[PDB]
């Protein structure tokens, strides 16, 4: 194994203002931390023991029509609800939340490699403080499920393919994280093996934009 | 005549799960905060009414915490948590880092901010005060206010058991989901408070008091 056995999997989803060339900004973030042991067909229930963090974040630029349509969030409404920007205080919060998880820790996000990870890297890079994620590992769950399954690889398509019922989470970062968790609990042992074999340092994720 | 502490801009629905009843000097095993802006509550839309949909914009924190002492049998059965299991899953104690985490979470919420917990005055608030008192940080809850939703709902209804489940079932005509779990009970509380949001907010504004005035459960 490249980096030992992952002790925590943190299921992650970011929602944002638009697609990568638009130089988007995060508008919502959910982390759901699960211990390796809590992982080790009826849709699986989440483990009893989990840590969860879900935050709405005011962006500096407007959401695109499509972004607002899909995420149900807009810059205007985030500001009327007094949401703060992606800022130093947020980094304090993330660092403390990460500190409570046993290490090595691995982020897991659907399409993380092409979207969530580089965007997170970019948001954290503009802060004065070093990234709270520099000791953390990551994997993309699209690749994971492609390997476990050997077809659409959208989140809902996978879920329905495995469980033969429609997904029932909200259209939110947390809803997407919960659906992802369910999918990852389909073959938990095999998923953990794939994660262990394929985990890579978040510090090697290239920022989406600079 | 004016409000004691202005209009609350954020309500933070809160639930604590613990190792036992108050005389056992219990320790927190799970904590959930769900922060909702005043405007999100007010924007909340028969007999029975549909269970209100939670607002699109919310912040949520849920954490499991290893206690220093074992859970009582009843506690483990009710909450689904045990000291042993929390430990096999690498959970950390209630410590300074946790206070910092809570502070940073609270900092993202517009002020004045008011915690709302069911039986909070008798249990959740004094227990939380006690846990925080053993840390080396200032209280993260300085400047934050608190109220007990039992008194709140008693008032709203008067305009009967007052356990969380009894109220929910009275208003919506079906049982809650995920009782005895911190997040589950928070969500149930949110649904109850969304029943009559304007009246709830008014009662909260008038009865909010500083968390700093809450007496610790034990020394």
Cα–Cα distance measured from residue A52 to residue A31, given in angstroms and rounded to the nearest whole number: 6
Cβ proximity of B141 and A130 under 8 Å: no
Residues 6+ apart with CB under 8 A from A71: A15, A16, A27, A28, A63, A171
Chain B residues lying within 8 Å of A37, measured CB to CB: 88-89
Q: Shortest Cα distance from A50 to chain B (angstroms)?
A: 7
- Which of helix, strand or coil describes residue B199? helix
Chain A residues lying within 8 Å of B94, measured CB to CB: none
Cα–Cα distance measured from residue B200 to residue B128, given in angstroms and rounded to the nearest whole number: 24
Q: HEC states along chain A? A: CCCCCCCEEEEEEEEECCCHHHCCCEEEEEEEEEEHHHHCCCCCCCCCCCEEEEEECCCCCCCCHHHHHHHCCCHHHHHHCCCCCCCHHHHHHHHHHHHCCCCCEEEEECCHHHHHHHHHHHHHHCCCCCCCCCCCEEEEHHHHHHHHCCCCCCHHHHHHHHHCCCCCCCCCHHHHHHHHHHHHCCCHHHHHHHHHHHCEEHHHCCCCCC
Beta strand segments in B118-191, E: 145-148
Cβ proximity of A127 and A92 under 8 Å: no
Cα–chain center distance at B163:
14
Question: How far lies A110's CA from each of A140, A144, B103, B114, in Å?
Answer: 6, 9, 30, 36
- Which of helix, strand or coil describes residue B122? helix
Residues 6+ apart with CB under 8 A from A72: A171, A172, B56
First-residue to last-residue Cα distance in chain A: 32
**Residue A107, number of CB atoms within 10 A of its CB:** 26
Question: How far lies A106's CA from each of A136, A180, A205, B49, B59, in Å?
Answer: 6, 15, 13, 43, 23
- Which of helix, strand or coil describes residue B208? coil
Method: X-ray
Cβ proximity of B128 and B28 under 8 Å: yes
Sheet containing B113-117: give its strands across. Answer: A200-201, A137-140, A105-109, A8-16, A26-35, A51-56, B59-64, B28-37, B10-18, B113-117, B145-148, B209-210
Q: What is the DSSP letter of B213?
A: G
Residue among A134, A140, A138 at smallest CA distance from A155:
A140
Q: Which of A49, A53, A77 sits opposite B61 (nearest CB)?
A: A53
Cβ proximity of B177 and B184 under 8 Å: yes
Q: Which CATH number fits domain A5-205: 3.30.420.10, 3.40.190.10, 2.60.40.420, 3.40.50.300?
A: 3.30.420.10
The residues of B assigned a catalytic role are 180
CATH classification (class only), B7-214: alpha beta
Query: Is B91's Cβ below 8 Å from some Cβ in A?
Result: yes
**Residue B21, number of CB atoms within 10 A of its CB:** 12
**Residue B54, number of CB atoms within 10 A of its CB:** 18
Q: Do B90 and A7 touch (CB under 8 A)?
A: yes
Chain B residues lying within 8 Å of A105, measured CB to CB: none
Cα–chain center distance at A183:
14
ω before B112 within 30° of 0 (cis)? yes
Query: Is A90's Cβ below 8 Å from some Cβ in B?
Result: yes
For residue A51, say whether it is annotated as part of any ligand binding site.
Answer: no
Chain B residues lying within 8 Å of A48, measured CB to CB: 80-81, 85, 181
Q: What is the DSSP letter of B139?
A: P
Cα–Cα distance measured from residue A107 to residue A139, given in angstroms and rounded to the nearest whole number: 6
What backbone phi and psi angles, to 5 degrees, belong to B117?
-135, 140
Residue among B74, B92, B143, B133 at smallest CA distance from B113:
B143
**Residue A48, number of CB atoms within 10 A of its CB:** 16
Burial environment of residue A200 by CB neighbours within 10 A (0 to 12, 13 to 18, 19 or more)? middle
Query: Is A85's Cβ below 8 Å from some Cβ in B?
Result: no
Sign of CA dihedral B65, B71, B73, B74: negative
Q: Do B85 and A51 touch (CB under 8 A)?
A: no
Of all residues in chain B, the one with the smallest CA distance to A77 is B57
How many A-B residue pairs are in contact by the CB < 8 A criterion?
87
Residue with the two structure tokens 């769900």: B34
Between helices B149-158 and B182-193, what is the axis angle to 10°? Answer: 30
Q: Shortest Cα distance from A118 to chain B (angstroms)?
A: 23
B44's tokens = 């909340």
């Amino acid at each position: 194994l490249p980096h030992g056995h992952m002790q925590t999997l943190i299921f992650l989803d970011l929602e944002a203002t638009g697609l990568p060339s638009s130089r988007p900004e995060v508008t919502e973030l959910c982390l759901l931390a699960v211990h390796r042991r809590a992982l080790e067909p009826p849709v699986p229930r989440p483990p009893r023991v989990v840590d969860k963090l879900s935050l709405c974040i005011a962006p500096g630029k407007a959401c695109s029509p499509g972004a607002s349509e899909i995420t149900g969030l807009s810059k205007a409404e985030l500001e009327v609800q007094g949401r703060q920007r992606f800022d130093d205080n947020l980094a304090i919060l993330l660092r403390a939340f990460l500190q409570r998880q046993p290490q090595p820790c691995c982020l897991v996000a659907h399409n993380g490699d092409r979207y969530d990870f580089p965007l997170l890297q970019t948001e954290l890079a503009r802060l004065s403080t070093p990234s709270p994620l520099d000791g953390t590992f990551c994997v993309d769950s699209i690749a994971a499920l492609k390997a476990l399954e050997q077809k659409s690889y959208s989140l809902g398509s996978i879920y329905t393919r495995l469980y033969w019922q429609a997904p029932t989470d909200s259209h939110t970062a947390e809803g997407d994280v919960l659906t992802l968790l369910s999918i990852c609990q389909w073959k938990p042992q095999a998923l953990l093996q794939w994660v262990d074999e394929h985990a890579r340092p978040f510090s090697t994720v290239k920022p989406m934009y600079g």
